[PDB]
Design an enzyme around this catalytic site. Structure first.
Site, mmCIF file in Angstrom:
data_model
loop_
_atom_site.group_PDB
_atom_site.id
_atom_site.type_symbol
_atom_site.label_atom_id
_atom_site.label_comp_id
_atom_site.label_asym_id
_atom_site.label_seq_id
_atom_site.Cartn_x
_atom_site.Cartn_y
_atom_site.Cartn_z
ATOM 1 N N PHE A 78 0.850 -1.181 0.000
ATOM 2 C CA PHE A 78 0.000 0.000 0.000
ATOM 3 C C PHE A 78 0.892 1.238 0.000
ATOM 4 C CE2 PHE A 78 -3.352 2.888 0.824
ATOM 5 C CZ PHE A 78 -4.470 2.265 0.310
ATOM 6 N N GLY A 117 4.351 0.651 10.979
ATOM 7 C CA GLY A 117 3.213 0.807 10.100
ATOM 8 C C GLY A 117 3.302 -0.202 8.973
ATOM 9 N N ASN A 141 -1.484 -1.000 13.865
ATOM 10 C CA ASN A 141 -2.603 -0.776 14.768
ATOM 11 C C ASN A 141 -3.879 -1.449 14.284
ATOM 12 O OD1 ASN A 141 -3.139 0.831 12.578
ATOM 13 N ND2 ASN A 141 -3.217 2.775 13.721
ATOM 14 N N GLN A 145 -4.906 -6.644 9.934
ATOM 15 C CA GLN A 145 -3.590 -6.689 9.306
ATOM 16 C C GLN A 145 -2.675 -7.663 10.033
ATOM 17 O OE1 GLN A 145 -2.336 -2.609 9.054
ATOM 18 N NE2 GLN A 145 -3.767 -2.154 7.393
ATOM 19 N N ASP A 167 -0.291 1.316 18.671
ATOM 20 C CA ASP A 167 -0.175 2.658 18.113
ATOM 21 C C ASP A 167 1.292 3.072 18.165
ATOM 22 O OD1 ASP A 167 -0.161 5.449 17.617
ATOM 23 O OD2 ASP A 167 -2.130 5.741 18.531
ATOM 24 N N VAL A 168 1.903 3.265 16.991
ATOM 25 C CA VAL A 168 3.324 3.618 16.937
ATOM 26 C C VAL A 168 3.603 4.869 17.766
ATOM 27 C CG1 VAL A 168 5.189 4.430 15.428
ATOM 28 C CG2 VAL A 168 3.759 2.488 14.728
ATOM 29 N N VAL A 183 7.701 3.229 5.788
ATOM 30 C CA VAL A 183 7.347 3.360 4.381
ATOM 31 C C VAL A 183 5.908 3.840 4.298
ATOM 32 C CG1 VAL A 183 7.039 2.165 2.183
ATOM 33 C CG2 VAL A 183 9.043 1.700 3.624
ATOM 34 N N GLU A 187 3.423 10.152 6.298
ATOM 35 C CA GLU A 187 2.207 10.716 5.730
ATOM 36 C C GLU A 187 1.069 10.804 6.750
ATOM 37 O OE1 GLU A 187 4.324 8.721 4.208
ATOM 38 O OE2 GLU A 187 4.133 8.768 2.025
ATOM 39 N N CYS A 313 -7.649 6.780 -7.441
ATOM 40 C CA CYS A 313 -6.631 6.342 -8.390
ATOM 41 C C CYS A 313 -6.485 7.318 -9.550
ATOM 42 C CB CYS A 313 -6.966 4.940 -8.908
ATOM 43 S SG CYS A 313 -6.753 3.668 -7.663
#
Ligand SMILES: Nc1ncnc2c1ncn2[C@@H]1O[C@H](CSCC[C@H](N)C(=O)O)[C@@H](O)[C@H]1O
Ligand SMILES: Nc1ncnc2c1ncn2[C@@H]1O[C@H](CSCC[C@H](N)C(=O)O)[C@@H](O)[C@H]1O
EC number: 2.1.1.300
Lengths: 338, 339
Positions: A78, A117, A141, A145, A167-168, A183, A187, A313
């Site tokens: 992603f 992440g 988180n 996943q 939670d980072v 990566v 953002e 997209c």
């Protein structure tokens, strides 16, 4: 007003893909005219002032797996792929890019690896299989996943992966890691100073931190509509107020880490990837509908999310393609502890 | 190589100022074509590769008549750009405007200890010492005549808060730390910025700041190597060593021992106008300049060689900094804190 009304037209198919591109082209030129200044003095001051503003913020302020298997490549990356020549497939681009991360982050078999992440584990699983002597820890988180990754470890017979559900921004550990990847994570951050200060404490002696961020080449900005005629901004980013970084912005956040190397890749790479995402969506649109209707609970709600991803997209492929990929692009920064 | 004959022709006055200006415009366009790349990926890689090459180098490579500097330079003998608010701004005014800008941006306050690295003839050392009588100002220069001039100025101006250390900054060892450090137009003489900033960082006191001003190109950096066999500028203006033209962002990649608090640039119009004023003052006083240089250099021909150097220096650099409305070569100011 019309900003709400134009969207529903798109969702009904009243707006062709090319008209969407034409709209985003208008959005692009307005953002670029907003960001650029006539002198370097002003252009630099704008960046430094923006960077200082992030230091007065907090460090930081769902999608069905079957859908991701359709739209994304085989590793469910992603984040952008690397296209050597667009005989490069979407699957090839994911692997090319992850091997580039491994080369540029100077990965060596046996190192401890932290993937912040980690998403659905594209890089966690790539590194774990390529460097079987490494121990790879991913942090996400998202329960689904983590469950997907742990299930992949079973299917793939991987013994060297651990996934931490945290939670980072609140995570704390006495463990340090030889290599840390972030990566497409910054953002989601705002105060890069607090983010890099915390991550710095996780870097082992002589370790390295590799960050890849989407950016504009020159200037940075919060996602705020440009005027009354701007619909893109709050349609793609409805909630919160995230930051589009600039390619040089992390150079101003070296209190706790220092830059070893710094690269950019042209916007062609994320543009080509978004085009591939759209193609895969479109080629399997009927299956996408059944997945979304099951998950979101109705046909109309399913088609609102479909329209979102198509516009996502189309708009972002146009944005990153601007001026041969020399406006919005990717920045990779390699840091050591300071 | 017919480059020598060209040089000997300039010295004997057969090459007009406009010819020198035109020669530099050609040099400028070549350097720009050399430095710019078609993609940001390539442009950035060129800068990072260049920065990394400095890390393996030496910190630096291993005398102008005072009456001449009194003519060419402004009243404070500033050997670095002034700030021109208008083009009513005189050379003297530009020197003071710029030094007050340094004091503002470096957050200078009365009572601070001040270190001025490569202080030259003391323009800023004396500016700060006069302005702030509670400051203790230390200047470092490797020139006996510069130190003597500054100490004589301290007598004339009745100042007691100035000390000048006669030392090579690249070999200087002290365990004194200072609230504020200036390096104005000094890193132009350095190569390994990493080694330089490491050494300077040890001299910064607790909560202290370091203010660096460097001439630069906006985008790319380079060593003064000739571009081709027609390049006379590079080795005429830099008859020794392999000095470096920095880029405006290059010190951002040297934050191991200091970290950036703020970063500004100023247009190449400011250095361009300053060099134009230097030339005008030289020309308006050419007879005394000749008198000074004929005496100092002995022969009227060696005097002519050195007058020519400074005229060409001013003409070419005025032209270079003017390029594209001042948006190519320019000034970078960086404010650093320790750690
Ligand atoms: N505070 C936080 N803690 C943990 N994960 C976070 C987070 N903020 C954002 N994330 C996650 O970070 C990811 C950014 S998307 C990139 C995922 C992965 N690096 C890849 O390249 O595929 C998303 O999965 C997002 O949900
Ligand atoms: N290693 C070194 N040690 C001391 N002085 C040095 C030096 N290398 C260069 N310098 C001096 O640094 C000065 C740069 S010119 C600028 C001088 C002064 N800062 C001003 O703004 O007027 C020159 O005087 C040069 O001779």
């Amino acid at each position: 007003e019309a900003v709400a009304n134009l969207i529903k037209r798109i969702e009904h198919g009243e707006v062709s893909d090319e008209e969407i591109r034409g709209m985003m082209k208008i959005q692009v030129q307005k953002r670029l005219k907003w960001g650029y200044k006539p002198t370097h003095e002003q252009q630099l001051a704008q960046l430094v002032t923006f960077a200082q503003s992030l230091k007065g913020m907090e460090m930081a302020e769902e999608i069905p797996l079957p859908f991701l298997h359709i739209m994304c490549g085989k590793t469910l990356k992603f984040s952008p792929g690397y296209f050597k020549d667009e005989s490069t497939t979407l699957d090839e681009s994911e692997v090319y890019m992850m091997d580039l991360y491994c080369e540029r982050a100077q990965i060596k078999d046996g190192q401890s690896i932290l993937d912040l992440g980690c998403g659905h584990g594209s890089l966690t699983l790539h590194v774990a299989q390529k460097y079987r002597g490494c121990k790879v820890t991913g942090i996400t988180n998202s329960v689904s996943q983590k469950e997907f990754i742990m299930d992949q470890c079973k299917k793939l017979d991987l013994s060297n992966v651990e996934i931490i559900l945290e939670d980072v921004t609140k995570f704390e550990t006495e463990i340090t890691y030889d290599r840390i990847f972030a990566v497409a994570l910054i953002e989601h951050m705002k105060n890069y100073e607090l983010f890099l200060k915390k991550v710095s404490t996780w870097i082992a002696q002589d370790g390295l931190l590799f960050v890849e961020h989407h950016c504009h080449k020159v200037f940075a900005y919060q996602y705020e509509p440009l005027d009354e005629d701007d619909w893109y901004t709050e349609y793609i980013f409805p909630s919160g107020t995230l930051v589009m970084s600039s390619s040089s912005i992390l150079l101003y956040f070296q209190e706790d880490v220092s830059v070893v190397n710094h690269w950019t890749l042209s916007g062609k790479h994320p543009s080509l990837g978004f085009k591939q995402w759209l193609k895969r969506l479109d080629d399997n649109i009927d299956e996408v509908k059944e997945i979304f209707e099951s998950f979101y609970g109705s046909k109309e709600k399913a088609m609102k999310f479909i329209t979102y991803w198509r516009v996502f997209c189309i708009a972002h492929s146009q944005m990153y393609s601007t001026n041969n990929g020399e406006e919005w692009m990717l920045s990779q920064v390699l840091f050591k502890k300071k």
